[PDB]
Amino acid sequence: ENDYERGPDPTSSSIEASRGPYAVSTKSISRFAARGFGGGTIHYPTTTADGTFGVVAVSPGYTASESTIRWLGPRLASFGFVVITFDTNSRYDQPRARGTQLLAAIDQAIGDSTVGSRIDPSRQAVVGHSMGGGGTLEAAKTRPSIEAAVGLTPWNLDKTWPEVEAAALQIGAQNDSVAPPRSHAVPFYGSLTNAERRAYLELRGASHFAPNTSNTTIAKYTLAWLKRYVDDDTRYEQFLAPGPSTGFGSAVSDYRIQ
Ligand SMILES: [Ca+2]
Numbered sequence: 001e002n003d004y005e006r007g008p009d010p011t012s013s014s015i016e017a018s019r020g021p022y023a024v025s026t027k028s029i030s031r032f033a034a035r036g037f038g039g040g041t042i043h044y045p046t047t048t049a050d051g052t053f054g055v056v057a058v059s060p061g062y063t064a065s066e067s068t069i070r071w072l073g074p075r076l077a078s079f080g081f082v083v084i085t086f087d088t089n090s091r092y093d094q095p096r097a098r099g100t101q102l103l104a105a106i107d108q109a110i111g112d113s114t115v116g117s118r119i120d121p122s123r124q125a126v127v128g129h130s131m132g133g134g135g136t137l138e139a140a141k142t143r144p145s146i147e148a149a150v151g152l153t154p155w156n157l158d159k160t161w162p163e164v165e166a167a168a169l170q171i172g173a174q175n176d177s178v179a180p181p182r183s184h185a186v187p188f189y190g191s192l193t194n195a196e197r198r199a200y201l202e203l204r205g206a207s208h209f210a211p212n213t214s215n216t217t218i219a220k221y222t223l224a225w226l227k228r229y230v231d232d233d234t235r236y237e238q239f240l241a242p243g244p245s246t247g248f249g250s251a252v253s254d255y256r257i258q
């Protein structure tokens with residue numbers, strides 16, 4: 001029995017679609033209207049007919065504006081999430097600061113006059129690119145009750161993450177020269193000893209900037225992870241285990257889950 005399931009039973013096709021079954025509404029937050037972060041956009045299912053949803057914040061990476069990760073906002077929201085994409089206080093904020101701002105973005109959405117009543121505040125998640133992906137681990141360390149964390153080509157100087165209890169997925173890029181997975185994503189995966197679930201998924205042939213353009217592999221597995229752990233939706237376990245193929249023509253070069 002699960003109170004939190006939303007949407008029809010999934011298929012490979014459904015989770016790859018550019019939009020899920022929900023129409024999406026949006027609310028802008030200016031830099032000066034934002035408490036603890038640099039402004040952003042809340043993307044939310046228009047309908048209230050199906051109940052409340054979990055809340056997901058999405059951080060950009062080092063040097064970068066919200067525009068580099070904004071595509072995740074409407075896409076994820078359209079599958080049944082309230083999603084806040086945002087700018088940081090400084091484009092050069094480090095992972096610790098990005099973690100704090102992920103939590104600030106969640107908290108502003110939770111209290112918002114438009115979307116607060118659409119969120120289940122007990123069910124929170126964090127997603128981020130680059131140092132924002134490092135920030136997901138920072139946020140899940142600070143706020144252990146986070147349900148799920150997804151790092152996209154994550155960067156963090158701290159390689160050890162025994163504090164994280166959330167379900168944590170790292171998506172690496174095989175040819176990343178900025179945050180190479182051998183020294184960032186893969187160490188994080190290995191050290192996530194206390195995580196509810198941990199996974200590593202590597203994009204074949206990809207560069208560090210793969211998460212900044214719509215990418216079906218990133219979207220489908222981010223979605224499946226968030227459904228599995230923000231909504232406890234066991235219908236999405238089928239995509240995670242045994243997980244994507246790594247054979248001829250696959251977009252995935254490595255996949256691990258524990
Ligand atoms: Ca550490």
Ligand SMILES: [Ca+2]
Nearest residue numbers: 147229230232
């Ligand atoms: Ca959960």
